[PDB]
Symmetry: C2
Subunit: 312 residues, 2 copies
DNA sequence: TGGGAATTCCC
DNA sequence: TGGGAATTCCC
């Protein structure tokens, strides 16, 4: 049966949600495989054609049951947190370049959410899926839906009250929904919507871009127990660790860990630790390895810093 | 003639304003001489007598034109950010040993201020002074109040906007005003206002308590210029210096400053610098000194740390 | 408490 | 497609 598929997925880490105050984002949500040598943006295609359609993107949460998020996708074909673009006659590939994510404050959550659920329900933007398991019975587009009843508005309120409590403002997903032409003109054949993978705010303490900016000693004697002051960018004391390693590739490469306690991490921007023992014992010659910060929650890592062990 | 006279001034530095979210300050705004277990708090006296008296404590603006501040003094005998005390029948010297300072949010500064001007007009608590000359008349012959009129609300809402733009949310000053009696229970024979000293918020980035936490190298060569990694509590890169000094007799003997630029202060919690040389090199025997941080602005400092220069 | 960190804003 | 700090809030 005809369908919607994501070609270019959105990249999970590295992009920052912006608050209204910050100004626009410089670029937009990037694609999973982007890099400076050659950048990229999220992309989807409607398989099995099924007539020139329209595609809507929306921000949903990262939970057991995907509901509406209170942050908003901002961009050219975007309005009220919902983006809407058309699938031209011949080309069924839709790309999403310059997509910003707008970050709401905890104050304006319930507020924004209630409106999103209101507009979703009247505009047929998947009310049973995202809003409440029992509502706005049916989808479609601009022909077969309109003004709400008290019971509904009421259901919409209890939903926003609860869901405001269970929303993470650090993680977000993209939901794409396509509409094939019903009757004549009126797009309304909604193909099953598909949710992208999680996108985490790089300004979130646990999804931050890890970095070693400078360390007092960049070489140490084989053994290790030499105290080193390392200055980094914001890290979480009970989740960070210093990883010394040697990329021998063909086999089990080397790996050791700087020694310290959570109390040694000074105000999130520095760690005073003690070097670990090189290749168990050692004698060698000056053996080069790398140092890096790594999060034990998600094993995400910082750019490497070259270290150098020297015999005794 | 009768005079209001601040005996004991407030603790000008070291007190933390608390958001309504945070509760009490445990103690009470202490005075300029409050030593642990020898507690002394702000004090005033009305000289030349006046009889039973009433005294209001209201928070005002540290600025080229003292106005009503947006924050609020909270405590017993304190209501709506205005405290009132009945200068005893014979005593005449009053003290407030439990004043707390409630920090408003940059968001709620207009509403709170506007209301403060309103309740200050409808009660004669220095309107033509704190608010706008135009509302000086406010006291007239009202039975302990007023019912605001035409421009007598407009100019208020007006002033609240221009003043909210001015406001420094880190500093406050107290204004004590004594109220003398007459025919019937009046207590409306004012006395010129007395404004205490500037009270700076401890949680203010530029009034916090300076402190050296750990050091890279605690001793050096008399021919300083050696690099140290210093972990400190919050400082500001453009207003910080590190001083190496020592005990001696009369006369400016030794005082040296660490070598670095603002770019070397790392995320406000660490500084990377070069040590200064002694007033020599040509000496024998290690000479102990002290290192201390200090704000270039006001010259506030931290508890010093030992340093030892070596010969060869 | 107040020592610290999460959240928001500013160029 | 940053860099760096100031503001509130927790417990």
């Amino acid at each position: 049966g005809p369908y919607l598929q994501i070609l270019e997925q959105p990249k999970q880490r590295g992009f920052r949600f912006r608050y209204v105050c910050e100004g626009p984002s410089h670029g937009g949500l990037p694609g999973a495989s982007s890099e400076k040598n050659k950048k990229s943006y999220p992309q989807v295609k409607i398989c099995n054609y099924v007539g020139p359609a329209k595609v809507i993107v929306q921000l949903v949460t990262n939970g057991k049951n995907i509901h509406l998020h209170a942050h908003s996708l901002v961009g050219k074909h975007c309005e009220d947190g919902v983006c809407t673009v058309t699938a031209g006659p011949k080309d069924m590939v839709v790309g999403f370049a310059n997509l910003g994510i707008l970050h709401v404050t905890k104050k304006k959550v319930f507020e924004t959410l209630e409106a999103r659920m209101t507009e979703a329900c009247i505009r047929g933007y998947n009310p049973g899926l995202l809003v409440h398991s029992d509502l706005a019975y049916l989808q479609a587009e601009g022909g077969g839906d309109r003004q709400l009843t008290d019971r509904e508005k009421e259901i919409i309120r209890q939903a926003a009250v609860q869901q405001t409590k269970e929303m993470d403002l650090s993680v977000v997903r993209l939901m794409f929904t396509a509409f094939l032409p019903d009757s004549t003109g009126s797009f309304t054949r909604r193909l099953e919507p598909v949710v992208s993978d999680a996108i985490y705010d790089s300004k979130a303490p646990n999804a931050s871009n890890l970095k070693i900016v400078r360390m007092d000693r960049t070489a140490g004697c084989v053994t290790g127990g030499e105290e080193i002051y390392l200055l980094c960018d914001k890290v979480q004391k009970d989740d960070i660790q210093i990883r010394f390693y040697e990329e021998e590739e063909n086999g089990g490469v080397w790996e050791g860990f700087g020694d310290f306690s959570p109390t040694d991490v000074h105000r999130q921007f520095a760690i005073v630790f003690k070097t670990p023992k090189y290749k168990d014992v050692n004698i060698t010659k000056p053996a080069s390895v790398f140092v890096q910060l790594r999060r034990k929650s998600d094993l995400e890592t910082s750019e490497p810093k070259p270290f150098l062990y020297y015999p005794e």
